[PDB]
Amino acid sequence: QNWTLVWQDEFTNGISSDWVFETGNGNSGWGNNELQYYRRENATVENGNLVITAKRESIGGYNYTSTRMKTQGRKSWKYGKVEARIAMPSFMGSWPAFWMLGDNISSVGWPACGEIDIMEHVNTEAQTHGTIHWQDHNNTYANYSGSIPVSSVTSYHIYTIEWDASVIKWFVDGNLYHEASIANGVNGTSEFHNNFFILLNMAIGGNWPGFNIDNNAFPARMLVDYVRVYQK
Ligand SMILES: [Ca+2]
Numbered sequence: 001q002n003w004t005l006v007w008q009d010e011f012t013n014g015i016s017s018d019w020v021f022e023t024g025n026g027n028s029g030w031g032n033n034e035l036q037y038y039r040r041e042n043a044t045v046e047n048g049n050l051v052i053t054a055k056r057e058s059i060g061g062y063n064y065t066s067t068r069m070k071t072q073g074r075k076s077w078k079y080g081k082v083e084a085r086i087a088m089p090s091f092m093g094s095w096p097a098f099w100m101l102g103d104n105i106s107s108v109g110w111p112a113c114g115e116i117d118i119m120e121h122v123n124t125e126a127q128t129h130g131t132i133h134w135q136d137h138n139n140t141y142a143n144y145s146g147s148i149p150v151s152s153v154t155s156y157h158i159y160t161i162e163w164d165a166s167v168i169k170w171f172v173d174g175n176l177y178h179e180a181s182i183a184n185g186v187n188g189t190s191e192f193h194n195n196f197f198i199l200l201n202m203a204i205g206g207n208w209p210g211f212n213i214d215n216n217a218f219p220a221r222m223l224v225d226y227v228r229v230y231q232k
Contacts, residue, residue: 136188146178
């Protein structure tokens with residue numbers, strides 16, 4: 001239980017150069033029929049917090065803008081404690097996330113690369129979700145998910161995973177709510193023993209949240225106080 005801090009973005013004055021930004025709606029709405037067009041302009045730093053603002057704005061044929069940012073190509077880790085202190089909006093159509101993808105997405109694709117969603121929230125739910133996605137030993141898409149009640153997602157909460165060669169554990173405010181064994185690649189989990197990079201985004205619409213958007217919730221702000229990675 002002795003952790004050493006190996007990386008952080010505290011967003012004290014700006015966004016570090018460890019982050020790369022996506023642009024646009026991607027392929028079929030980032031694969032989930034999302035409605036937003038991602039931009040760099042939707043990411044700012046105010047008063048020591050990263051602010052991802054989703055807006056009702058027309059660009060590229062789309063009606064919403066937001067930010068999707070990642071450490072891919074800059075920083076990645078194999079095992080560790082990954083955490084962020086986040087305050088997010090709660091409205092119909094909202095889809096904020098703090099998550100990780102395997103560095104090998106560029107060669108094996110998704111979902112074989114593996115995905116660890118440290119925090120996902122949709123719509124106005126009074127809970128948050130922690131999930132892994134992968135391609136198992138039978139060549140089939142697999143997922144394993146858990147949730148925890150959070151009454152005020154609009155307040156800051158700490159979203160964390162502890163990940164080692166045996167397991168991934170999910171916590172909110174230090175409360176354990178989900179766990180997945182990756183020991184010996186059980187259930188075809190071999191790709192979780194590789195380097196993963198971090199992503200932050202707020203999507204608007206999509207298969208999971210649905211297409212009922214509260215247009216009176218714009219502009220909407222997702223606040224990240226910090227992102228920290230510790231390792232043994
Ligand atoms: Ca900060």
